[PDB]
Design a protein around this ligand. Structure first.
Ligand SMILES: CC(=N)N1CCC(Oc2ccc([C@H](Cc3ccc4ccc(C(=N)N)cc4c3)C(=O)O)cc2)CC1
Ligand SMILES: [Ca+2]
Length: 223
């Protein structure tokens, strides 16, 4: 997260860290047994880490649970990142408490202008590399589709939305992928892609979660 602020230990209880010997992507806990992340984060041998603050220090509030199965969206296109969403089932149910909580799915999509909270352990530099060990947060509004499509001609589908600032300076970045974009207390987006990080006229692109609620519910109930 570039231009954000330190969230504070366990202030984003639904945030998860996907680990394969190291942190590689973020995710969101939707219930005690399921995690939603980005399809481009797919890997074999994923361990889900909950209750995390500093990813390099064990503070006693963590729960490390291996994934039993991963389900990438059936229409995921790796070339365009259309339908960049995947579901991960935990081998054992997570114990929900103050520091480990689930985030609710939307009843409707969020309108442009709505302020959201984006979080992650990704790169904090727009130019250069500096990975934080503590969770970073960023408040950002959902941008109009026009501004989004103008920034990325012919690359934005109805399953994506832009959020952030056209002037640059604040944005999600590499390492934040698969992470949560929560607006009005509901999971509205998943960190997907963009052009660089925090660059002028290049806002972040996120998977529009409100389009997948039916698929999510049917899939988790059948697996
Ligand atoms: C042809 C087409 N339709 N495209 C091209 C691919 C594009 O997807 C991608 C997929 C991956 C990449 C990465 C770089 C990357 C990865 C994750 C990111 C996550 C967030 C942000 C951001 N600035 N908000 C930027 C990122 C940038 C890389 O360098 O490999 C960049 C664009 C979708 C749009
Ligand atoms: Ca830790």
């Amino acid at each position: 997260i570039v231009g954000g602020y330190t969230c504070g230990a366990n202030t984003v209880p639904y945030q998860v860290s996907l680990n394969s010997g190291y942190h590689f992507c973020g995710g969101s806990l939707i219930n005690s047994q399921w995690v939603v992340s980005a399809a481009h984060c797919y890997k074999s041998g994923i361990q889900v880490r909950l209750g995390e603050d500093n990813i390099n220090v064990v503070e006693g509030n963590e729960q490390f649970i291996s994934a039993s199965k991963s389900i990438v969206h059936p229409s995921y296109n790796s070339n365009t990142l259309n339908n960049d969403i995947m579901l991960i089932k935990l081998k054992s149910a997570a114990s929900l408490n103050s520091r480990v909580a689930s985030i609710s799915l939307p009843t409707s999509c969020a309108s442009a202008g709505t302020q959201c909270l984006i979080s992650g352990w990704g790169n904090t530099k727009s130019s250069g590399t500096s990975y934080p060990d503590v969770l970073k947060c960023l408040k950002a509004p959902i941008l109009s589709d026009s501004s989004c499509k103008s920034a990325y001609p012919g690359q934005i589908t109805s399953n994506m939305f832009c959020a952030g600032y056209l002037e640059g300076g604040k944005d999600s970045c590499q390492g934040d992928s698969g992470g949560p974009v929560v607006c009005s207390g509901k999971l509205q987006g998943i960190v997907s892609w963009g052009s660089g990080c925090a660059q002028k006229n290049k806002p972040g692109v996120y998977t529009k979660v409100c389009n997948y609620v039916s698929w999510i519910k049917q899939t988790i109930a059948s697996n």
